[PDB]
Write a protein that binds this ligand. Structure first.
Ligand SMILES: CN1CCC[C@@H]1CCO[C@H](c1cc2nccc(C(=O)O)c2[nH]1)c1ccccc1Cl
Ligand SMILES: [Mn+2]
Length: 297
């Protein structure tokens, strides 16, 4: 009846030596991580970048998310979104936000997605460009002050602004930036893969965890087949890029049909990498702030 958590994906704790170059480290962990689709990477304890967005100006109108919309077939600052998000969660669970077990939010999320008796609606500050108010990482833009002790983070290969993003092509010889996600409890992203089957890297700057599910690329067609069988027939003929706007599916349904699924709780200061053609989806445990970019190898 209640949700059964998938097995945990790999977590890596690189030494300072291994942490020198992201692409080299990702290439070395690939034989394991590609078999789980997603992995988590914990930087060394002393690697702590400052938060570098323009907080005074940061304003956005999040999208509304009706958790049960398939089954059924306003403007905020960072501060005022946080107040709304914490009030929502503490009221929903009748306890302080940090006291709510991650497993309980997870079980309740999947219950609500399939419930026709209770219509829970949340908001997500999703797909906000780093160009609007800056990246959460420091950048040598000349647009914001960088303290000496922060320069190493502006120059780090793990700063998402410094990941390689240009794919090799003939058109490149003939002829972009990270996105931000301000989460609250139950805000979510449905199953998808990246454009061009790209890798992605995701960093949780601060706040409560982001819960992830991943499927390895060798099972991509299995997942697509389960979607074909069980996803709303009204949307069955839609191209993948549109279907993936609403590809909501409980991980246990995929697991029951033989699709390998792995989970993790990404906590503040931790990276999640998604491998090429690894389907993923997830939800936020509470008020948080993430940055993500597609990268090339
Ligand atoms: C146009 N393309 C095509 C592929 C996705 C990309 C657009 C961004 O799609 C959002 C998203 C993707 C994603 N991947 C990792 C983590 C998170 C996070 O929210 O933390 C993510 N959010 C998304 C997708 C579906 C439903 C809600 C939302 Cl918000
Ligand atoms: Mn993604």
């Amino acid at each position: 009846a209640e949700f059964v958590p998938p097995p945990e994906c790999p977590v890596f704790e690189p030494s300072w030596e291994e942490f020198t170059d992201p692409l080299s480290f990702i290439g070395r962990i690939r034989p394991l991580a590609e078999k789980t689709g997603i992995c988590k990477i914990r930087p060394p304890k002393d690697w702590q970048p400052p938060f570098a967005c323009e907080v005074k100006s940061f304003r956005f109108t999040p999208r509304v998310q009706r958790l049960n919309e398939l089954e059924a077939m306003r403007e905020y600052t960072l501060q005022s979104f946080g107040e709304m998000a914490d009030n929502f969660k503490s009221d929903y669970f009748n306890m302080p936000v940090h006291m709510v077990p991650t497993e309980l939010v997870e079980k309740e999320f999947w219950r609500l997605v399939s419930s026709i008796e209770e219509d829970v609606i949340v908001e997500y500050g999703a797909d906000i460009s780093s160009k609007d108010f800056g990246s959460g990482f420091p950048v040598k833009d000349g647009r914001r002050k960088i303290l000496p002790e922060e320069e190493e983070y502006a120059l780090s290969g793990w700063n998402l602004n410094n990941m390689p993003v240009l794919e090799q092509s003939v058109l490149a010889h003939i002829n972009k930036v990270p996105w931000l996600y301000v989460g609250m409890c139950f805000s979510s992203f449905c199953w998808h893969i990246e454009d061009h089957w790209s890798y992605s890297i995701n960093y949780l700057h601060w706040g409560e965890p982001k819960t992830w599910y991943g499927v390895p690329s060798h099972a991509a067609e299995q997942l697509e087949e389960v979607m074909r069988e069980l996803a709303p027939e009204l949307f069955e003929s839609q191209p993948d890029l549109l279907h993936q706007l609403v590809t909501i599916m409980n991980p246990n349904v995929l697991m029951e049909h033989g699709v390998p699924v792995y989970r993790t709780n990404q906590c503040a200061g931790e990276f999640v990498v998604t491998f090429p053609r690894a389907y993923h989806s997830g939800f936020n445990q509470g008020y948080n702030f993430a940055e993500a970019v597609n990268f090339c190898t």
